[PDB]
């Protein structure tokens, strides 16, 4: 239909209204550029918001809820148009409908509104949205509820966990216990958004990381870390990666839960984003205590990092360089020279042909601290020859006339070990 014909019917006013609003919903579901902006300009949102209230006529409720859901899926200004029409409390009222498909539609719409950003998220929370949403999940068996219904509640819950400033502590504390239950329910999509919700909560001050970790979720997170569904592995690795940016005791909980045994598959995972985030998390584990570095050693992960450093897309090679410089900064003399036995030298020397000023210095820091270990064991002469034979000395020799801070770092290696 055209928008004009819809307006004659909404303002004809009850049997006529449903067909026209129904007609609006079909128009707003169309594939290419549903004409969202003209429906707002025609003034139809206040009637649609009015439409959520005909407890008598559930059909006009559902259609208006659907039309409004799909206006709120658009730009921030279009979402703003929905909120400005009063939809939040009307949708919150609709969560309690005895008709399951209408309750879900309100859940979905509320998910779109909260997903726009931190201001709309907190405003939805301020209206009292958390309790009736959680009240819907307060069943003895989560497999009691329709599968599609449960998926939206989890998704809607995850957008309430998302995003400067963070959600009020009370909201995260209040929603979280239902989140842990959902993290164990056997549906692949529910799990993904549970991990997403958990992934959001662990990005921030160590007090927030600490909070999720108390609930015993880390063993389960490492389990999803090994799932075959990529939509599950992706958020699980993000959540684990955030946790290992924290303190030494939180990092010990991830290792002890068995996370490292999954990393041979992850650091060779053919999905570019999986391999890089696994390399980044390794960079934060190798920034830990010496007993945790030997545990990466014990799990055999050094050959895998030499492999990523040797051949991967360029951004991971930079992530591995941090893992290596971190390893060489905190490790024992034996652990660092063990790097040399594993073949660390050639892919490092090959990577120094790169012109980015920043990574050159990261690689050179690793090389000097490694030489200092060689100094303690009396093996510097073996290493100097090793660096020269794979072409590393020429490159190092060439960096004196290449940022000047890179150049003075390169000369120092030359004066001390190649004179």
């Amino acid at each position: 239909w055209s928008v004009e014909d819809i307006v004659k019917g909404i303002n004809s006013n009850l049997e006529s209204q449903l067909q026209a609003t129904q007609a609006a919903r079909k128009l707003l579901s169309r594939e290419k550029q549903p004409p969202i902006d003209n429906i707002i300009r025609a003034g139809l949102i206040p009637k649609f918001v009015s439409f959520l209230g005909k407890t008598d006529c559930s059909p006009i409720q559902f259609e208006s809820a659907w039309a409004l859901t799909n206006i709120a899926s658009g730009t921030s200004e279009q979402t703003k148009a929905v909120v400005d029409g009063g939809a939040i409390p009307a949708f919150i009222s609709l969560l309690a409908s005895p008709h399951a498909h209408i309750s879900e539609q309100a859940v979905w719409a509320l998910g779109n509104i909260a997903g726009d950003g931190s201001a709309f998220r907190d405003l939805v929370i301020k209206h009292g949205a958390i309790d009736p949403l959680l009240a819907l999940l307060a069943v003895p068996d989560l497999s009691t509820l329709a599968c599609g219904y449960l998926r939206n509640l989890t998704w809607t819950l995850s957008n309430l966990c998302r995003n400067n400033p963070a959600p009020p502590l009370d909201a995260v504390e209040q929603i979280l216990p239902t989140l842990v239950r959902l993290l164990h329910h056997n549906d692949p999509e529910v799990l993904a958004d549970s991990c997403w919700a958990i992934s959001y909560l662990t990005d921030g001050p160590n007090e927030r990381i600490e909070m999720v970790v108390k609930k015993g979720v880390v063993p389960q997170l490492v389990k999803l870390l090994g799932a075959t569904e990529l939509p599950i592995v992706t958020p699980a690795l993000r959540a684990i990666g955030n946790i290992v940016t924290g303190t030494d005791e939180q990092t010990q909980k991830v290792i002890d839960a068995g996370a490292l045994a999954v990393f041979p598959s992850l650091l060779t995972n053919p999905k570019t984003n999986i391999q890089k985030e696994a390399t980044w998390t390794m960079s934060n584990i190798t920034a830990g205590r010496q007993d945790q570095i030997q545990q990466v050693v014990n799990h055999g992960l050094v050959p895998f990092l030499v492999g990523v450093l040797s051949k991967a897309d360029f951004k991971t090679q930079k992530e591995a360089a941090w893992a290596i410089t971190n390893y060489t900064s905190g490790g024992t003399v034996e652990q660092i020279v063990y790097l040399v036995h594993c073949g660390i030298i050639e892919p490092l020397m090959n990577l120094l042909s790169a012109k980015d000023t920043k990574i050159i210095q990261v690689i050179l820091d690793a090389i000097s601290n490694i030489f200092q270990a060689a100094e303690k064991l009396g093996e510097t002469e073996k290493l100097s020859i090793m660096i020269e034979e794979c072409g590393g000395l020429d490159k190092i020799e060439a960096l004196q006339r290449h940022n000047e801070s890179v150049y003075k770092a390169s000369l120092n290696l030359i004066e001390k070990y190649f004179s």
Partner: peptide, 28 residues
């Protein structure tokens, strides 16, 4: 030192994965 996600995402974005923000209903 440990480096938090903002620094990683700042190094690597655009394109860092995240969950769905909005969904359009075509179904039902």
């Amino acid at each position: 030192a440990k480096k938090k996600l903002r620094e990683y995402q700042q190094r690597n974005s655009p394109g860092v994965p995240t969950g769905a923000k909005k969904k359009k209903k075509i179904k039902n």
